[PDB]
Design a protein around this ligand. Structure first.
Ligand SMILES: Nc1ncc2cc(-c3c(Cl)cccc3-c3cccnc3)c(N3C[C@@H]4[C@@H](N)[C@@H]4C3)nc2n1
Length: 440
């Protein structure tokens, strides 16, 4: 099985992985930048290796330096966490070919679900409901485009398969496609674009799944990620309000079927749009996500532990029927940023006071005297609460945040406090545009 794992990430996720590894007696190699010598997970690691200077491009995206670090320590596997190289098939390919286990799916399954039209193909095939759309790439024959666009009706949206554009009227279609195409070739190398029916007030609802090398696959309810700001999630909860065991079972089961159809491997998320009682699949994340803890709180599954087990060729430690959703969980992403302008706020944390008590979980690499660096994201902590009901999780989050002291830098804690007392948020079922409007 796995005796030594390279942690090819940083911050809170590298510590989350270290904690999992230590619990299983798996030896940890922490690959780190110059600027990340002082990370909690790095100081707690069994072996450490500087893989290059502060910029992520010459460190955490340094495919050769990480593989090299695996070769030298005689590592068995590599955990890419989230972001960086986690969705990079070329990296996954270079890992498997160099004789190590990539903790996550196989290269050909990453490429497949990385391309959104071919991903959408798979989900239609598995009986999984998708957005009314082009059902494939759209051609430059614009007569044929108007036809599909007028079938689904306006507004429509044009997305890249591997930077999207809302079209409100037929008058602005022809140009609006050729634009989106030309941006992609110059940017993402791939001129391929597809149409969907643009949903104006959807909720963002994600199903968590696990698939193993034994042919088992499970769904672990959903998360509502609707409370976001310009493509950055701010609060997450599980389960998603309004969604029943009946609907959870159905679309949950269909995501589990799909995992097997495509020979999916490890932890993964099916993202959905949710409007007017109906689910519409949009894309799939082939990795562990930031907001995994809220799912852990309501299922008592250790998603990173199962990632390690699955990667070692073990079956998932439990069966679909052993999972029951109990209570409700909230995660506030605590960022070192100005709570109104969202300008990063790096520098020394002088005093940290973590909250605690019943139903309060604190996932953070930050400690008193830790300097939040400029070179990466602004996330410093994930504050997660559990309650028997949505009300208690919210009230518990409120008390937890007013207990949280972070001196020396600004945080978005005042933002979280605003959201948690918002009457619409308390009511629940706020769509994906709510936070932007409220900040007006
Ligand atoms: N057909 C259709 N209709 C509505 C959509 C809304 C979003 C979206 C989401 Cl899910 C969250 C936050 C913002 C948006 C979004 C993106 C572009 C324009 N308007 C809203 C959206 N997104 C697709 C992809 C998510 N990871 C990011 C944003 N796709 C949509 N597709």
């Amino acid at each position: 099985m796995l005796e030594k794992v390279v942690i090819a990430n940083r911050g809170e996720i590298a510590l989350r992985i270290l904690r999992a590894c230590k619990e299983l007696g798996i030896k940890t190699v922490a690959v780190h930048s110059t600027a990340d010598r002082d990370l909690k997970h790095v100081l707690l690691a069994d072996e450490t290796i500087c893989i290059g200077p502060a910029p992520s491009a010459k460190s955490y995206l340094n495919i050769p330096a990480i593989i090299a670090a695996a070769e030298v320590t005689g590592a068995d596997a590599i955990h890419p966490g989230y972001g960086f190289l986690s969705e990079n098939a070329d990296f996954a390919e270079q890992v498997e070919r160099s004789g190590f286990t990539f903790i996550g799916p196989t290269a050909d399954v990453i490429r497949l679900m990385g391309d959104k039209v071919s991903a959408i193909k798979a989900m239609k095939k598995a009986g999984v409901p998708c957005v009314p759309g082009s059902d494939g790439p759209v051609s430059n024959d614009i007569a044929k485009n108007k036809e599909i666009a007028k079938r689904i009706g306006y507004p429509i949206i044009i997305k890249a398969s591997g930077g999207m554009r809302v079209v409100r009227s037929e008058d602005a279609l022809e140009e609006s496609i050729a634009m989106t195409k030309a941006e992609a070739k110059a940017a993402f190398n791939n001129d391929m674009v597809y149409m969907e029916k643009y949903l104006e007030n959807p909720r963002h609802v994600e199903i968590q799944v696990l698939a193993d090398t034994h042919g088992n696959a499970v769904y672990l309810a959903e998360r509502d990620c609707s409370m976001q700001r310009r493509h950055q999630k701010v609060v997450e909860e599980a389960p998603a309000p309004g969604i029943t065991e009946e609907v959870r079972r159905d679309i949950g089961s269909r995501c589990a079927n799909a995992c097997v159809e495509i020979g999916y491997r490890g932890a993964g998320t099916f993202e959905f749009l949710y409007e007017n009682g109906e689910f519409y699949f949009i894309e799939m994340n082939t990795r562990i996500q930031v907001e995994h803890p809220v799912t852990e709180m309501i299922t008592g599954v250790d998603l990173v532990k199962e990632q390690l087990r699955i990667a070692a060729g073990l079956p998932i430690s439990f069966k679909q029927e052993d999972i029951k959703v109990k209570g409700h969980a909230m995660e506030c992403r605590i960022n070192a940023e100005d709570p109104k302008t969202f300008l990063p706020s790096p520098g020394k944390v002088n005093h940290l006071h973590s909250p605690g008590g019943l139903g309060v979980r604190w996932d953070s690499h930050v400690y008193g005297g830790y300097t939040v660096p400029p070179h990466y994201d602004s996330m410093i902590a994930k504050l997660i609460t559990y309650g028997d009901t949505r009300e208690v999780a919210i009230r518990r989050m409120q008390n937890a945040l007013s207990e949280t002291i972070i001196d020396g830098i600004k945080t978005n804690i005042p933002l979280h406090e605003l959201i948690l007392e918002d009457e619409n948020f308390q009511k629940g079922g706020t769509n994906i545009h709510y936070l932007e409007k409220k900040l007006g």
